[PDB]
Amino acid sequence: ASPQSVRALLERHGLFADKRFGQNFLVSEAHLRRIVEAARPFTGPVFEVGPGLGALTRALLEAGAEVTAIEKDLRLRPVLEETLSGLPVRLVFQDALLYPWEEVPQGSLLVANLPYHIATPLVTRLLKTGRFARLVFLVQKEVAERMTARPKTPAYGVLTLRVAHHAVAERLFDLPPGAFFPPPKVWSSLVRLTPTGALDDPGLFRLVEAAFGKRRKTLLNALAAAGYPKARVEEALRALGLPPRVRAEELDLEAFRRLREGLE
Prior knowledge:
Catalytic activity: adenosine(1518)/adenosine(1519) in 16S rRNA + 4 S-adenosyl-L-methionine = N(6)-dimethyladenosine(1518)/N(6)-dimethyladenosine(1519) in 16S rRNA + 4 S-adenosyl-L-homocysteine + 4 H(+)
Distance between the termini: 56 Å
CATH topology of the largest domain: Rossmann fold
Number of strands: 9
Number of helices: 11
Shape: elongated
Subcellular location: Cytoplasm
Order of helices and strands: HEHEHEHEEHEHHEEEHHHH
CATH superfamily of the largest domain: Vaccinia Virus protein VP39
CATH architecture of the largest domain: 3-Layer(aba) Sandwich
CATH class of the largest domain: Alpha Beta
EC number: 2.1.1.182
Radius of gyration: 21 Å
Protein name: Ribosomal RNA small subunit methyltransferase A
Family: Belongs to the class I-like SAM-binding methyltransferase superfamily. rRNA adenine N(6)-methyltransferase family. RsmA subfamily.
Strand order of the largest sheet: 4-3-2-5-6-9-7
Largest sheet: 7 strands, mixed
């Protein structure tokens, strides 16, 4: 609710949160409301990864969502059981990487608060299922930048292309450190993904992973390192009108698909 509310709730449960705690709790009601708005309409059940103290959980329920809140930090069990007491919510303590995503109804909604820098494993797991109608991510600003990056920019990489393959992305707004307690060192952002129904293309992503394997290598050399024969790659690049020493970061999703087809 605000820094003293949170601190007092955590202390009741013998917890101390500073910048090392592992998460950052929403204390901004204005931002809370905007997040609920981003997730509408509630046309499928919501799976909320990282409920924190349950602030968003409560707001989602009040807006008519059905929510399954999935929390990795077992220390928050007494806190959430209290804050969610008497509410129609399912509370699960589990690493979201292990949650049975293949069980969720097709058309479900995913809302995830992922405060850390490397979000790629989980985002990839969720998108590969093809089971969500909408995914809303509250992430570090730099992660949102990667998810929505243009070619030839610092943020551009495998995660950009994974997102683009499965979904249309929107960076909706940023959130300052002061919206959270403890305040994080970086700004956060809210990103909405609307899946297209595209499922994995595993051969495409073996190529894309290889292409971005080493930052300061040409695409030719990066693919050679993963066992794509240079002679075959050279020819494929020639056929596409690409520079012989073109770099992975210069290629868009369409170009990666054409390259993959060329090599097959």
